Structure formats: structure tokens, C-alpha cells
Design an enzyme around this catalytic site. Structure first.
Site, PDB file in Angstrom:
ATOM      1  N   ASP A   1       0.825  -1.261   0.171  1.00 22.25           N
ATOM      2  CA  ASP A   1       0.108  -0.160   0.205  1.00 22.25           C
ATOM      3  C   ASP A   1       1.390   1.608  -0.014  1.00 22.25           C
ATOM      4  O   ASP A   1       1.140   1.898   1.253  1.00 22.25           O
ATOM      5  CB  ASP A   1      -1.105   0.142   1.291  1.00 22.25           C
ATOM      6  CG  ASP A   1      -0.076  -0.186   2.259  1.00 22.25           C
ATOM      7  OD1 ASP A   1       1.165  -0.538   2.864  1.00 22.25           O
ATOM      8  OD2 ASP A   1      -0.961   0.601   3.210  1.00 22.25           O
TER       9      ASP A   1
ATOM     10  N   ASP B   1       7.629   3.529   3.064  1.00 25.41           N
ATOM     11  CA  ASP B   1       8.260   2.456   2.797  1.00 25.41           C
ATOM     12  C   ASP B   1       8.293   1.212   1.514  1.00 25.41           C
ATOM     13  O   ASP B   1       8.931   0.720   1.017  1.00 25.41           O
ATOM     14  CB  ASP B   1       7.819   1.836   4.370  1.00 25.41           C
ATOM     15  CG  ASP B   1       8.534   1.991   5.408  1.00 25.41           C
ATOM     16  OD1 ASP B   1       8.759   3.427   4.970  1.00 25.41           O
ATOM     17  OD2 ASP B   1       8.773   1.974   6.506  1.00 25.41           O
ATOM     18  N   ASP B   2       6.881   1.332   1.358  1.00 18.93           N
ATOM     19  CA  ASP B   2       6.328   0.336   0.197  1.00 18.93           C
ATOM     20  C   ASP B   2       7.273   0.703  -1.214  1.00 18.93           C
ATOM     21  O   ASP B   2       7.708   0.079  -2.167  1.00 18.93           O
ATOM     22  CB  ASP B   2       5.274   0.631  -0.067  1.00 18.93           C
ATOM     23  CG  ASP B   2       4.504   0.055   0.937  1.00 18.93           C
ATOM     24  OD1 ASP B   2       4.249   0.948   1.956  1.00 18.93           O
ATOM     25  OD2 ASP B   2       3.812  -1.587   0.526  1.00 18.93           O
TER      26      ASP B   2
ATOM     27  N   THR C   1       3.399  -5.964   1.836  1.00 17.15           N
ATOM     28  CA  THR C   1       3.735  -4.970   3.513  1.00 17.15           C
ATOM     29  C   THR C   1       2.622  -4.231   3.485  1.00 17.15           C
ATOM     30  O   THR C   1       3.362  -3.360   4.106  1.00 17.15           O
ATOM     31  CB  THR C   1       5.012  -4.591   2.893  1.00 17.15           C
ATOM     32  OG1 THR C   1       4.990  -3.701   0.916  1.00 17.15           O
ATOM     33  CG2 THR C   1       6.121  -4.923   2.216  1.00 17.15           C
TER      34      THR C   1
ATOM     35  N   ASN D   1       2.358  -0.365  17.196  1.00 16.44           N
ATOM     36  CA  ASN D   1       2.513   1.191  17.189  1.00 16.44           C
ATOM     37  C   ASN D   1       1.463   1.419  16.476  1.00 16.44           C
ATOM     38  O   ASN D   1       0.325   2.355  17.673  1.00 16.44           O
ATOM     39  CB  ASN D   1       3.389   1.535  15.953  1.00 16.44           C
ATOM     40  CG  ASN D   1       2.322   0.421  14.919  1.00 16.44           C
ATOM     41  OD1 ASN D   1       1.818   0.181  14.755  1.00 16.44           O
ATOM     42  ND2 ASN D   1       3.819   1.199  13.652  1.00 16.44           N
TER      43      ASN D   1
ATOM     44  N   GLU E   1       0.359  -3.860  15.784  1.00 17.54           N
ATOM     45  CA  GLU E   1       0.761  -3.264  14.385  1.00 17.54           C
ATOM     46  C   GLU E   1       0.037  -2.764  12.936  1.00 17.54           C
ATOM     47  O   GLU E   1      -1.066  -3.346  12.796  1.00 17.54           O
ATOM     48  CB  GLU E   1       1.904  -4.372  13.841  1.00 17.54           C
ATOM     49  CG  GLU E   1       3.099  -3.586  12.554  1.00 17.54           C
ATOM     50  CD  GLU E   1       2.280  -3.675  11.436  1.00 17.54           C
ATOM     51  OE1 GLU E   1       1.603  -4.250  11.231  1.00 17.54           O
ATOM     52  OE2 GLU E   1       2.509  -2.908  10.855  1.00 17.54           O
TER      53      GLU E   1
ATOM     54  N   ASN F   1      -0.073  -2.893   9.923  1.00 16.32           N
ATOM     55  CA  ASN F   1      -0.499  -4.219   8.904  1.00 16.32           C
ATOM     56  C   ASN F   1      -2.002  -5.027   9.252  1.00 16.32           C
ATOM     57  O   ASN F   1      -2.580  -6.025   8.808  1.00 16.32           O
ATOM     58  CB  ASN F   1       0.487  -4.226   8.330  1.00 16.32           C
ATOM     59  CG  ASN F   1       1.366  -3.377   7.633  1.00 16.32           C
ATOM     60  OD1 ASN F   1       0.142  -2.803   6.783  1.00 16.32           O
ATOM     61  ND2 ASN F   1       2.996  -3.782   7.244  1.00 16.32           N
TER      62      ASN F   1
ATOM     63  N   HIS G   1      10.530   0.746   6.965  1.00 12.53           N
ATOM     64  CA  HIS G   1      10.039  -0.770   7.224  1.00 12.53           C
ATOM     65  C   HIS G   1      10.008  -1.735   6.311  1.00 12.53           C
ATOM     66  O   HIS G   1      11.345  -2.439   5.944  1.00 12.53           O
ATOM     67  CB  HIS G   1       8.622  -0.861   8.057  1.00 12.53           C
ATOM     68  CG  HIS G   1       8.632   0.136   9.251  1.00 12.53           C
ATOM     69  ND1 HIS G   1       8.929   1.906   9.359  1.00 12.53           N
ATOM     70  CD2 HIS G   1       8.857  -0.078  10.355  1.00 12.53           C
ATOM     71  CE1 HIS G   1       8.922   1.952   9.978  1.00 12.53           C
ATOM     72  NE2 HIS G   1       8.986   0.648  11.025  1.00 12.53           N
ATOM     73  N   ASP G   2       8.855  -1.860   5.234  1.00 12.06           N
ATOM     74  CA  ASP G   2       8.331  -2.508   4.123  1.00 12.06           C
ATOM     75  C   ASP G   2      10.270  -3.248   3.620  1.00 12.06           C
ATOM     76  O   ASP G   2      10.001  -4.719   3.291  1.00 12.06           O
ATOM     77  CB  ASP G   2       8.021  -1.764   3.130  1.00 12.06           C
ATOM     78  CG  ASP G   2       6.814  -0.985   3.511  1.00 12.06           C
ATOM     79  OD1 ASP G   2       6.815  -1.157   5.436  1.00 12.06           O
ATOM     80  OD2 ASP G   2       6.146  -0.655   3.327  1.00 12.06           O
TER      81      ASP G   2
HETATM   82  K   LIG Z   1       3.435  -0.297   3.517  1.00 13.83           K
END
Ligand SMILES: [K+]
Ligand SMILES: [K+]
Ligand SMILES: [K+]
Ligand SMILES: [K+]
Lengths: 308, 308, 295, 295
Positions: free
Chosen positions: B9, B13-14, B119, B153, B159, B161, B234-235
């Protein structure tokens, strides 16, 4: 006309429902789609094939859909009762997954022309709505056999088709299409009384015998744990509704689904309380018109005749 | 080789994750599939298109998938940060729904050759497993960026996701494929430190500038509520894992998802307790190899060069 | 000085916590309350009487409190005041000056909860609460929950939600309180029937648990709670918000703490982290010496 | 004869139930307990004192019990024994012969629950429990739950789960107890300040509720509970299993009854169904006469 798609898990009731639908002249069966139930998807599908053949159905796809509920685990017989299957069916299963099949029909036809009639768990219906949100405004309405506002069977407060996949049920009831819940409260009034069975015996057609055979087999098992003077047939009621609303009274009330209760999981929660909304896309079935209802079934049988 | 499908998404990060994947020579991006996130499916998809174009990606389908979570409600910007979109993209969206697209790729390729790398929310992944149970034994493994065994978070314990679609998460974690959870516990170690940013600035390519632009924009917003010396990415970590497992340590532990907790909804529940099973299809990421991890990203950038 | 009311469900650790409570000079033991635990309330009371004798304790009332959790089904010489722990507790708090006692629960919170609800005035007289329960990143009864909390989740919810100061000496800390060989020595060389009574107990329940598998060493828990009282400095603590999960299927009874960071300045709860092995053990030991041999 | 302990949270219906309790000859009113309801415990106690005076009741102790549900946050002349309803209750039951009192709760079950947990011996001395709470196919606080249950679901769970005999006089029944015009007549023609005090109250809270919309008539609830005591014959009952929902999001506090049929022979719970309007109303009326005019 009355075009529908019958989503079911053929055990006794679905069979009658298929018979009625196929036999009634106001219904146009676009498809028979299958879903996991108290029997596996594979078994339920054969059963549907079996019926299709008995009734002499043709050019109506039978597609298998989901083999398990969305999130919950199911976590738990030869032909259909005493009726043996032929080595091979005349009617085969499509390869389109019920879900993919339901979206195309819907999307390939004019808006507001197809009625969905689910008689088992709501899983395929739910998957298709989530997979193609567009189908929710195209569909004429959803008339389902399931739930119970003041009656349960799977449990004290819950009905099988719902407890089986409460999330799919939650999805379906919360989408915006118009939903008619034909639950235990109505269905229990649909008794196959001796006079009725007699009337059925009088039709004297293979399909009528077949029906009685399966009725007998399941009824015994059922009316064998305790005592039922007579058994009720559920599923056909949904179909009867589309043929002719006037066959039962309904009530417009909000209905949502319990996903968290310890005792009340899957309960179709209905609010009949003091101010009833002005805009409500849900309604519940209340009173059955017995004579008209059984007239419909008897008619369908007379018309099916003896196919083959 | 290393063939994957990146389900994401695109927010900051993605994008990096897409860059790394596209740029690293051991990865073969079969597709970029999109899912509803903190931004709508439509917005997230443009973003992906935007990146695709910047990175000079070609012949890799971008398919939009689910616009809402399975059961929960989401119940709640111009280009991407300061970067404007062109009037029209070079890269268009397929018409196959991500879900339908994921099943074909999987089913059209040899077994155990495609790695799924989600992700964002697990909704498409969940839908596809439920829609074609066959894909679960074909897929090589599932490496996802999400969860957190000792860190949350979206909440104290959860988290994003995962909290976003706990059922999809429940489906995914309970299917039998091999699952690597790359959560907050690992990811938080992925700091874009000043030296790193410098190194990035030194690459001097459009895509590198673009990256810094979006980093800057989001970082400020973020590191603006309170104080982050540096933000973590992150991703990309998930992708880095497929490029080279050795980039982090993992631990084999059962992980399931909380669907009912008031405080703990969506928590990825991990059992590190006294007898650790002999057969466990789940594992968690524990320690990041910083230098190798950022080396990978810097490499991918150098290789992407300045496309167009 | 320290006045406390050690609330417990005596079995291995309670026992010790009791010894350290008694045998420590700075601890004034108003009472010993009893609560259904792994064992039946009865058994837990007898047990507590045994130990009391064993420690040569007198003038400390021993009252039995609740025998079943508030809502959940458990499901699987010195005499006993006729006072129900809960009443006893209420009086003691009503019967003394404000902020002078500290409640030291080492079983489930069902007497504490009941007591807070029966007489509400006690949450604000009580000095502070120091329990040995929970785990913020650790579980024993489950991947995430701890025996004392999960036994009576509502009760715990109540306590954690009252306004008083709660200090949770959870598994995170308590798993540091190891019974290591060297320790088993200085204990051995104290030569009091209690000292022995320790190892006797240490060992029986030492093996059993080590027995399933291989707790190279064992750990005490209950005492740590006392320890902190006696000398807060003995272990570190982080002031974080804490709440109890009542509805998760996987997470029921989990002590959920928020370490996310913006941290509030007005936090009534806090958690134990790092222990001073040494300081800890000394304490225990001194107390054993000090008891000498119960005439 | 009938000894009871009317547990309540006085407001309109409690009030009446109190009158009928007092003014009925076959009812011996050991006590009037008080529990936080729509109103603050304080207010509910005063109220109860007012009414008591109003009814010219003496020798009946009036004790205030709990001021907040066990676990949930509520969230939105005659004096008061220093006894906390809960203790008072316990004694009375411990202080008399077995199976002679009947508990008559008409607010939430939080004193009853607390009391069952504090002294367990009472569930088996108590004669039986008769509450005005719940709805098996009806709800008011929600589509499915009733005000008295949902206020303290745990408490209710407890009570319903104890072994004693419970009779639930729920909405299904209570919605039959109508205050119809003709009734408002014979009441009017009693001419006692209480009789008046009735309509005064009947009406104020008559309209308000009828006010949102159009409760052609109003209904009393609380009394029905007493009524049944006085003459079980007054309404019908079905012996079905009943349990309380604690975790449903839509169904919290629902009194869930199983009418499915195979029916167990050993059922400790039962539900009220059909009321004898006439018999009911008479009772109420006679009681009003009998009270005469409180000197
Ligand atoms: K993401
Ligand atoms: K069916
Ligand atoms: K203990
Ligand atoms: K009341």
C-alpha cells in the site's frame, strides 16, 4: 421472469428448494452454486448433481464454491439417504468457482434483475461482495433462508447457516443491498403434514418419490432423536418468497450479526424496539401462508412431471 | 532468480521496498499488487504507479485488489508528499483484480517458486487463499512486513498492517505455508541515519532524489509529533530477507492472531515458552544486519541508475 | 518499619515471602490473608498455618479470604480469625492512619478486589500496592498471561483500575530471582530448621518444575514483592500504564503495558525490570539468620 | 407470612414494589437494601428513605450496598444502618432458619453477587431468588438486554450461576403490568397520601417515558416481582435454563434462555410469562387501602 441464483448446500431442504425453483414457472434459475455445510463441499455438490438429474434440469450451471468458512473452522453417508448415485452424472460441474460465476452473471446482466437466494452458509455470497463490490448495487435483492430472531437450533439463539460462518453473515447483512431474512421463526411453520405427504404421494412421479424417499430418510433420523409429529422444510420458503412475496408477512427491522458472544455467537440480532427506522435495508419473515406455500410445491411437482 | 509478488500500500516504505526489489539483481518482481491502507486503494495505486514510473519499471503488472478489509470497517494529500503526479502515467493498472492476478501467476508457474511479500494489510493474500486453496501449497513461502511480538504502534501491542484486517491476518497465519513475520521488533532497527542519508544523496539519481524527497516529507510529519533522531524504514526489510535471509536472524515460534481482545486486538501472539515445537511453520525476525541491509538498498539505487 | 498485609495463597514462593516478611526487621506484618490458588482455600490456609508455626510467628492474625474467583470458575499452633480476609483487611486499613500500610498480594487479586469494592475508602488510605503478578513481555500460564492474573482477571482488572499506586513485580523481574548452587550453600550453612525447611521445599518444588525439563536453576517470585517494599532500590521500575485483558481468546489475563512514547506524567502504575541479585539474596539470607530457631 | 429482603435502587417502580411489600399482609420485610442504579447510591438511598417515611414504615432497616458495578463503569425519619447492605444481607440470612427468606432484587445484582461471594453459605440457606430483571425475547437498554442486567453483567452472571432457585420476572412478563385509565381511577379513589403519592410519581415518570413517544399506558415492573412472591399463581412461569452474555458486542447483558427441546428435568432457573392483570392489580390496590394514612 424472476431470475435467481440458488446458493445452497443440498441436504433434504435444498433439494426441495431446487425442485420448487426449477418447477415454478415464475422463476428463472440462472445457476445452482454450492457451499460447504454440515457435509463437505464435494459431497454437497454431488447431491446437487443428483437432484439436477432427477428433476431433469438442463443448461443451468452447478458451480462449487467455498470449501471452508472465511475465518472459523468447521472442525468436524453413501448416496443421499437411500438413493444411490449413478456411476456418472448427466450434469457436470463448471470450472468457474461459484464466486467467480456469481460475479459474471450479475455483471453480465441488467441491473436489479437477479435475486440471490442463499440456503446455506453465506461464504460465497460474502466472498463475491468483497471481491466485486460492484455486484452489491446491481443485485435486485438478497432473500436468504437463515437466522432466527426469537429461535435457534444450532444453539439456544442461533441458526446453522449463520453460526457456520458468522463473518460471511456479518458481511452480507451489513452490505447495503436489500435483505430478507427467512429464519427459523417462519420456517418452523412449514410442516410437511400427513395430508401434505399424501398429496405428494398422489403426484406419482419419479421426482415426487425421490422427494419422499429423502424426506423419509432424514425425517426418521431427525424425528428419531425426540418427537416431531411432522418435520418442517426450510429452504423452499426462501424461494417461495421470490415467486410470491405475499406467501408470508415480513417486518422491516435492523438485523446485525453477533461475532463475539460466548452464548450468542451467530445470533441474528433484531431490534423490534420503540422507534422503528424510516430507512432500513433489512426485513424478517414472520407468518407463513401454509396452503399457498404447499400449493406452490405441489404445483412445481405436477409441472416437473416425469423428465427423461 | 527469486520470483516474488509484492503486495503493498505505497506510502513511503513500500516505495523503497519497490525500489530495492526492482533494483536488486536476485529478485524477479512478477507483480506489484495493491491493497487498501491508511490511504484509499485508489490513492495507494496511483502512488505505486508513480514509483513504477520513477524507477523506470516495465512489464510488471500493477493490479489493484481489495478496497476494504474483510470484515472490519476502516471507518476513517496531493501527489505523494511534494512530488506531483504527471497528468497520465506511463504504467497503467491491469484489469485483473490483484486477487485473481495472484492466483494465476501462482497457478501458472512451477510449485514452490513464488514468494509472496505483503507489506500492507493481508486482505488480498487472505482472499486468494480462501478463493483458491490450491495456492497455499504451491507458494514457496510468505515473507511479510507486519506484526510485532513485543512492540506495537497502531496500539500498545499491535501493528498497523495487522490491526487493519485481523481476520485476513488470522487466515494468513493459520494457513499452512511457511510464514516469516518481519515485525516492529526487527524493523525498528532499520534507521536511516544521517550517514545513510548522505550516502543516498551521493548516489545522485532522480530516483534517489525522489526517495529523499518523500523521506523528508514523511519524516518531518512523523518526527514532528515528537522526536525521532532518525526514522526507520520497514517494508524494504521484508524484501531484503528474500534477497538474503542472512540479513537478519529469525526464530521459529508459533504466532497466531488475537481477534477478540479489547486491548489486544490484532496482537501477533508469539509463544517463546519452555518446550519449542519440532514442527512450526511460523518464524519471527529478531536482529537486523544494519550494514548489509543498507548496503542492499544503496546497491539497488546505483543499479537502477537514472532510467528514462 | 513497614506495615504490610501479605495477601497470599501459600505454596512454595508464598512460604518464603512469608519468612522474609517475618524475619526482616523493617517489616511489620499486620496480617496474613489467604486466597484460593492452585490449591483449595482450605489447603492454602493450613499451609499458611504450618509455615507460620515453622517461622515461629505469633500475634499475626491469619485470615482466609475468598475460595473461588469473582466470576471465572477456577475450573481444574496459630489459629484462623473468624474474620474473612476481606473484612479483616478493611478494618486494618480503616483502623490505622492513612498511607501507612502496603498491600502485598502474591496470589490472585480476588480478596483485594472484593475489599476495594466493599469499602471504597481504602484505595485512598492504602499507602500503595505491591503485587507479584503479571508479565509485560513474558507469560507462564500462557504465552502471554501469568498464573496470578489469569486466575481472576476481573479482580486484577479492578485492582489495576483503582486509583492507588500499583507496583507489578512480574515475571520479567521475578525470573531474575534465581536459586543458584552457591545460594543453596549459604542457606545450607544457616542450620535453622527454617533454613532447612527452605531447601526442603526449595528442592521438592525445585525438581518438579525443573523436571518437565531443565530450569538449570529455579527462581522465587513472591519474595521479590516483599524485597521491593523493604528496599525499593533492590530492583528497577518503569512507570508505564497497565491494564488487564478480559476478552481476548489468546490474550485473556494479559497485563498489557504501553511503552509507546509519547509517556504520560500522571501514571499510577509501574513495572519491575532489573533486579540486584546480590542485594536480593542477602535480604532473604539475613532474614533466615535473624529468625534463628523458633523456640 | 413471607420474609423477604427487597434489594433495590428506588425510583418509580421500586417505590411501588416497596409499598406493595409493606402494605401486603403476607409479606414480612426483613430489610430494604440499596444499590447504585440510574441514580447515585446516595440519591437512591435518600429516595428509599423518603418513600419509607411516606409509607409509614418503621423497624425495617434501610442499608446502602454498592455504589459502582463490580467491574463495568456505570459510565454515564427512617435512618441508614451503618451496615453495608452486603453485610446486613449476610447476617439476616445467617441469623435465621434455613429456607425462610426470599431475596427480591429490583436493581442490578451487584449487592447480591458480592454477598454470594463473601459468604457462600447463603446460596444454600436462601429460600429462593425472585428478581425483576432481564427479557428472554425482549430488551429495553438494547434490542436484547434489560437495564438491570446490563448495568452489572458479571454480578448477574454470578447470581444466575449460583445453585439457588432463581425466578426471572423479565420484560416479557412485566410489560403486561399496565397502568390503564380505569386503574388510575380506583387508585384515585383511595385518597391516602400514598395512593396520591403513587399517581404523582405514576404520572411524572408516566409522561416522560410516554413522552418520547406514546406508551398509550405505562407499566410497573418492580412490583411484579413482589406480586409473584405473594402469590406465585399470579403469573405463569416456564422452567428453562438461563445464562448471561458477557462478551457479545451486540448481545452484552442478554438473559439467554434455551427453550430448545429436549427440556432438562433439573433446572434451577425459571422465567415469567403470562400475568393475571386482575389478580395483580387487586394486590397492589388492597395494599394501598391497607396502609391507610401513615400517622
Ligand atoms: K506498507
Ligand atoms: K441448506
Ligand atoms: K503465590
Ligand atoms: K428498579
Amino acid at each position: 421472469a424472476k431470475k435467481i441464483i440458488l446458493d445452497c448446500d443440498p441436504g433434504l431442504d435444498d433439494a426441495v428448494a431446487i425442485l420448487l425453483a426449477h418447477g415454478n414457472p415464475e422463476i428463472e434459475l440462472l445457476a445452482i452454486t454450492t457451499v460447504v455445510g454440515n457435509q463437505t463441499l464435494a459431497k454437497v455438490t454431488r447431491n446437487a448433481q443428483l437432484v439436477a438429474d432427477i428433476a431433469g434440469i438442463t443448461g443451468v450451471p452447478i458451480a462449487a464454491g467455498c470449501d471452508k468458512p472465511l475465518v472459523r473452522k468447521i472442525m468436524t453417508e453413501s448416496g443421499m439417504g437411500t438413493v444411490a448415485y449413478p456411476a456418472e452424472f448427466k450434469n457436470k460441474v463448471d470450472e468457474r468457482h461459484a464466486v467467480n460465476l456469481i460475479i459474471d452473471l450479475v455483471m453480465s446482466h441488467e441491473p436489479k434483475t437477479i435475486t440471490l437466494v442463499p440456503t446455506g452458509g453465506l461464504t460465497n455470497i460474502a466472498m463475491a461482495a468483497r471481491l466485486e463490490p460492484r455486484i452489491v448495487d446491481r443485485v435486485k435483492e438478497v432473500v436468504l433462508m437463515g437466522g432466527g430472531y426469537h429461535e435457534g437450533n444450532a444453539t439456544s439463539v442461533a441458526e446453522f447457516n449463520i453460526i457456520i460462518d458468522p463473518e460471511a453473515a456479518h458481511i452480507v447483512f451489513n452490505e447495503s443491498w436489500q435483505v430478507t431474512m427467512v429464519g427459523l421463526d417462519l420456517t418452523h411453520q412449514a410442516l410437511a403434514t400427513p395430508p401434505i405427504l399424501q398429496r405428494v404421494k398422489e403426484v406419482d412421479t419419479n421426482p415426487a418419490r425421490f422427494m419422499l424417499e429423502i424426506m423419509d430418510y432424514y425425517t426418521k433420523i431427525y424425528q428419531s432423536n425426540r418427537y416431531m409429529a411432522a418435520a418442517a422444510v426450510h429452504d423452499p420458503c426462501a424461494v417461495a418468497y421470490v415467486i410470491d412475496p405475499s406467501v408470508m408477512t415480513t417486518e422491516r427491522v435492523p438485523v446485525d450479526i453477533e461475532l463475539t458472544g460466548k452464548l450468542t455467537l451467530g445470533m441474528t440480532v433484531a431490534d423490534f424496539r420503540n422507534p422503528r427506522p424510516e430507512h432500513c435495508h433489512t426485513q424478517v419473515a414472520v407468518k407463513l401462508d401454509f396452503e399457498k406455500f404447499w400449493g406452490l410445491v405441489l404445483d412445481a411437482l405436477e409441472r416437473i412431471g416425469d423428465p427423461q
